[PDB]
Design a protein around this ligand. Structure first.
Ligand code: 9PP
Ligand code: 9PP
Ligand code: 9PP
Ligand code: 9PP
Ligand code: 9PP
Ligand code: 9PP
Ligand code: CA
Ligand code: CA
Ligand code: CA
Ligand code: CA
Ligand code: CA
Ligand code: CA
Lengths: 265, 266, 265, 267, 265, 265
């Protein structure tokens, strides 16, 4: 990790003095569900490129931005465009925004992503509530928490078993019903692996048998950092393709808006 | 990745202007399979050391060399000496030759390696056709494609489900009939891990139960990069040992690979 | 790597001239097993920080020292305080002391650690004789032996099938049944992952299915390096907790002291 | 050596595609001489931070921008804020903008800076036309051209003996007379050293003895990179202090002087 | 610079909580002048190797230490063994102790070193009060201040013209009188160059013509950092040799201890 | 410095076992003076690229090779193609061949280079015996000897005042008479700066007043490494241009060939 505590402080100060908004919830839009930014009122945008110490997108001319605004009666900050390990960023860079949010006053992080369905019951287009995750990179030591611990953020050995908020999942369901959805609200374990190439048939089977319902190349690192610093976490995976074992983004967007009401404080 | 597109190009040009040869198939010989380089005729050799941008071998006294020639009717370029992650090379160096091959005009990459047997039915001396792989290093982000995508080679999110060419696997099985050999041509999933130490009993069991048939510390990186830049891929693992679960065939493999040349399209 | 052979030597020569003791066995004490240093006689101590090329502990106020002496009438060298990958150290540093030991003349390495129980039959306070291990980081290439091989220490492809000495596993059991406890001596597979966060449920379940009986974030690197340079190896995990799938340290200590007599040569 | 040729192309292409302006001259504005960005007509700005591969400013709250515009009937590209070796940038990042300017089609580089006066006859407010320079970091190898030469920019061993365009210097003197100035236009050698600290007395005498007239911590790397890739170069120093051997006033003069010289720049 | 402001803080606090002394002045002893460490009563020592963030000596057998004590009613901290660019350390490590001293409450820095005599009138054994310096490495940018400026220590462009305290220079000559010496107290310009080879004849002549009186491979970096962070400064070179242009260590030692009285505060 | 003592040993062994020649003199040809290699009899060439640990040339199409052969009855090892700091090599690479030659048994290094004449009396085509040098990069610490000193090669602070052999210089003047050249054997101080650009007028004047007679971008690092490891050294600059202050190669070839006979043992 090449950031010092003060780097995080400097970026949060710079933001608090360039916007007066004071979000309590942050949201990381996955690939495709980035449209949630529009439909946020009193919008104020910052190019990641101009924020001090912020990682800068790779795809030239596709640089992301941090949008401060009101979603559905709640003050939030959202990431439009994210950083992945396969793009060459170390996790301490990928997850930098999360510790900044915490210092901005945020208390709840909502993560979303487009994933590959491993579970056969999932159909192209469904929404899966993340109840748990499997961190493959972490098994080898690739972890944003690697390095001496920063007490001012969290403890040395952060529990992860309860990473995803119990209450939020219940509410996620309740609020999915009122919507009057015909297709049910899926629920699974998300498995993160490096990328960028997609899985071989042998790997998909192995991951499935490993107990994974969906695969992606993101999110896990953010959640670990979020949980380490004490943020409340909950999030979803938009199954955009089922994996070879041998569009509907809009609904996730509004579903996320409504959810805002369910977040405490 | 510390190579820019032009690096690859400079290397291809240097080779293209230093040899009259114009290979259409590339072969990476596994450990103890370098004998396949003999058998090439009209051969021309280049030490890895003298080639611009080429990684140089680590193992003292094992130079490393690229050999161009005709095998059994087909123009080939061969690697005699391989690079491995356990030697300290990052995958962008291990797989560097592959992209040079593509820029040279190569269209098919043949991979070969010695591996340990996981499948209970496998015997020493068996030849396993690689039908698929499990890239364990890749589960943690160690990947030759990590970093921004170079579109002039291939796409950002390359598919791997069809990595090992289907028409070749069928031609492999049919051609093996003509080998005369008594034992069958095995087939399976090759799992790659880092090494250099061989597996423990719990690891062997664990890998077998994950669906792996053969274990090694190579090949997969090269396959990923080959598929990324559109090369057709087919290969084999010589089972030189049966892993603890609780030579007279390397020549056969060489002759089989020579035979198979005549079965590669165009 | 990062150290050359002469480094390991320089460090060995330094320790050799700074103490006349000539240990035959080395002991790496795990978390909480620090107390094995006391109950060692004619002890001579060296702070990690003053010994050439030795890595220095991260934890503030958690110094780190190498202790030479006599344990149960046996000359050995013990590490009070260890090095983990989650602290920021690459394995070529974590395992640096092991090769130094081989150069000192040590012929047997005893590894100790605190671990999480994955095997349902284990109870907190249990002592699990390490029978085998699963090196998860090793699968992705994180390995203290990565880089050109140093032939003066060992071979290119060392075998790991018989890492934990069969004879000591027999003599460990024969000796345990001479201390009497309502609980028998446990035996099993130690799986190592990076850290520093504790496991999720999905991961905990995953690891049990791999055939793991106990999780940790150390030890495996030292064992691999010890077998590579021909040291005899054996060790124990002290189950300090049971993993969630949906008054015992002093024991190990006297147990480890007893086994000294059972060590060959 | 940290950038590949394509990195410069990418950066140039991204600029050439975000603006239709096509500068013939680039100007690097010295310390506090940035008011000249005004005077520019049809200005189009781009913060350094947003341009691909561009170094980003260190001093918090000093952003830094590249402005394209017309000065006095002449297409220009100007740097508002610059990079210095003393801030931690290696010379290959400090001079990165100069190569991009060449790729944009710029043919002439105008460089200015604030400098400490070493010549005893200089006074605060003097403007010193740069006739030559002494590159001290260069004597130890810290050089923006270190590394394998990129032939597409220039030759391996470029000459520096004629770095500062003679014609432009004569035109600067003609131009200065036409402005009605009383205090003569000084002219001499600029010596660059690393910094960030100001010199000791023994260092100031030593530098004067090396033939230096003014001292600063910038400009020379850019000049060297500019000559290597063929740009014509002209520059001067605003003497803001007399060095110890034992202002904004001279601003709108500098800006008018630079504006006037635009018309004397060939082609 | 690899150190963040807080690294300087952690090192200062540590020293502060490990000793009760509160030095007001610091002394850096040059080659063959570490005897001064003694003469210090109430000596409390710390090996460099054990102080957090401290660089470690290079030459085997010379560990180097930081000693706190009294020199003449004067509470001070001294460096026995210093760091050099020629050894491989970047100037930001060479000068790390100076900023730590400042944070320990030190106000005055005394620097001493051994040097080659360029001034042909100097004689081996002479002591040369340092009046000015020439920082050759600084001409090409090798400077401990390179990098973003840290306001908490000093300004962006610190003056260096009055680096060697004028009053102390006067008290130094005086005090040399009331010490009754047979040789005059020399005073001149110290020029720092990299090393480690000694000068060629052409270099020596060149150096004398730059106005240098004594050449060496240290001190200047330390003085630059001290001045940058507000320390008063003065020092001496002990001319241990005359350079090819075509013993008295105890003295310097007693001279410095005498000067303790004349240091303000 | 990235090389360890054993890399040198490894490289020397590889060479000693790949040729039977055992030269006692090494010659480094200047860029442009590479014709000395032709003229060599019973030559055996090794491309730099195949020699373990050797730096490899950057100029594509100009391989660079080490040639072993007989010059004027004397066995030589010759470098055809040289390494320079301006090409990006650190001095520890530039001078790597020099320490290898010592390990091969070489006792004398003949350095050769093309340079710019500073002395107003020099004329193009002059040959200047190098009598002394000024190492500008060394004034700022860029020095092949930077880092821990390898006592197996030499001392910590090697003397440089007698770098260019006294006896070989007299011999060179005698041999020159025998060549009956219109012009005399010039003699002087070689100054080295980094490059790659050539000097401005102000720089030439300064370099000249520094006491330098010729300017180049090489040689000095090799000479320093040479003397540090006890090699005798002598060299010449071929003045190929008079610097702006406001063929003859065959001659240098014959000259060096004649001197082979005058080199000791
Ligand atoms: C590429 C995409 C994730 N992503 C989408 N589909 C897949 C798939 N089949 N396999 C893997 N390993 N990852 C997949 O990223 C979307 P994100 O930015 O929202 O994480
Ligand atoms: C060492 C050999 C591979 N290789 C051969 N046998 C084994 C085995 N049992 N386990 C592992 N992990 N690797 C094995 O390399 C052969 P290649 O270079 O052709 O891949
Ligand atoms: C933190 C402790 C290991 N350690 C103890 N319990 C656990 C657990 N449940 N999960 C993981 N991943 N590690 C665990 O380390 C102790 P050592 O230093 O003696 O290895
Ligand atoms: C710091 C200022 C230059 N600069 C102005 N005065 C001096 C002085 N006396 N010494 C040194 N070394 N530099 C001086 O920079 C202004 P620029 O950014 O326009 O070059
Ligand atoms: C090597 C010694 C300095 N030092 C002593 N004599 C000389 C000399 N003739 N030339 C150079 N360049 N340095 C010399 O270091 C002493 P310090 O550690 O107190 O600076
Ligand atoms: C470029 C050539 C040296 N070289 C030749 N002439 C000059 C000159 N005027 N200025 C500088 N700085 N260097 C000069 O290299 C020749 P070598 O490799 O034999 O040193
Ligand atoms: Ca930025
Ligand atoms: Ca090579
Ligand atoms: Ca230490
Ligand atoms: Ca940017
Ligand atoms: Ca230390
Ligand atoms: Ca090579």
């Amino acid at each position: 990790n090449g950031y010092t505590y003060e780097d995080y402080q400097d970026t949060a100060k710079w933001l608090l003095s360039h916007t007066e908004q004071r979000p309590q919830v942050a949201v990381i839009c996955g690939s495709g569900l980035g449209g949630l930014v529009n439909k946020l009122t009193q919008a104020q945008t910052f190019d990641y490129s101009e924020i001090p110490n912020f990682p800068e997108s790779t795809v030239p001319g596709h640089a992301g931005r941090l949008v401060f605004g009101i979603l559905n009666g709640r003050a939030c900050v959202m990431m439009q465009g994210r950083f992945h390990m396969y793009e060459g960023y170390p996790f301490w860079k990928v997850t930098f925004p999360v510790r900044v949010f915490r210092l901005l006053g945020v208390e709840t992080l909502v993560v979303t992503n487009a994933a590959g369905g491993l579970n056969p019951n999932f159909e192209v287009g469904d929404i899966m509530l993340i109840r748990d995750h499997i961190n493959l990179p972490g098994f080898s030591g690739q972890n944003p928490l690697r390095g001496p611990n920063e007490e001012r953020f969290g403890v040395r050995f952060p529990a992860m078993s309860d990473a995803y908020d119990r209450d939020m999942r219940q509410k996620a369901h309740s609020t999915w019903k009122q919507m009057g959805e015909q297709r049910e609200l899926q629920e699974g374990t998300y498995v993160m692996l490096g990328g960028p190439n997609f899985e071989t048939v042998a790997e998909c089977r192995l991951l499935r048998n490993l107990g994974a319902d969906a695969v992606g190349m993101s999110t896990v690192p953010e959640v670990i950092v979020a949980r380490h610093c004490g943020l409340r976490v909950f999030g979803f995976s938009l199954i955009t393709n089922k994996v070879i074992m041998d569009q509907a983004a809009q609904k996730l967007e509004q579903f996320v808006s409504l959810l805002m009401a369910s977040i405490p404080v």
